[PDB]
Design a protein that fits this description.
about 65% helix, glycosidase, hydrolase, 3-stranded antiparallel beta sheet, Lysozyme, 3 strands, 9 helices, O-glycosyl, bacteriolytic enzyme, mainly alpha, elongated, binds chloride ion
């Protein structure tokens, strides 16, 4: 298992514009296009992202390219973030994957707000951090995926994804 396979499981793959769990226009492997309520605005963001007139449909290869770019940006965003970097640095390879997943889903700002859980993670208090992570809108809105990510942080294994 790896970050790519993990996120692919969590986000799925869709080749036509769709609405995410929050009602935002998305495509591919969890690539948010816009928070705007307009499909045209979404189609415009899509063409610009792909470099062509898509008509809201993309190919698998194009979905994967957006995916690669998004994972790279997530990692890069973590490394440039003063609140995130330290946590990330302190973790093992499996748990780092859990943190990238959260950043991929909620953005660097969102994650940077989990001040207390981050601290517990840096201290390596696995069970306590898991309880604290669960007390969030994040867990209440997408409980199954949140449970998978939490289990990953708790155990340091990929068991939740196997
Ligand atoms: Cl983009
Ligand atoms: Cl879920």
């Amino acid at each position: 298992m790896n970050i790519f396979e993990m996120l692919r499981i969590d986000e799925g793959l869709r080749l036509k514009i769709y609405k995410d769990t929050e009602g935002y226009y998305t495509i591919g492997i969890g690539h948010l296009l816009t928070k705007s309520p307009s499909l045209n605005a979404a189609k415009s963001e899509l063409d610009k992202a792909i470099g062509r007139n898509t008509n809201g449909v993309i190919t698998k290869d194009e979905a994967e390219k957006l995916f690669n770019q998004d994972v790279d940006a997530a990692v890069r965003g973590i490394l440039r973030n003063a609140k995130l970097k330290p946590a990330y640095d302190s973790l093992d390879a499996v748990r780092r994957a859990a943190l990238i997943n959260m950043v991929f889903q909620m953005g660097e700002t969102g994650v940077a707000g989990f001040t207390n859980s981050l601290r517990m993670l840096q201290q390596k208090r696995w069970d306590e951090a898991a309880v604290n992570l669960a007390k969030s809108r994040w867990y209440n809105q997408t409980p199954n995926r949140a449970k998978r990510v939490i289990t990953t942080f708790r155990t340091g294994t990929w068991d939740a994804y196997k």
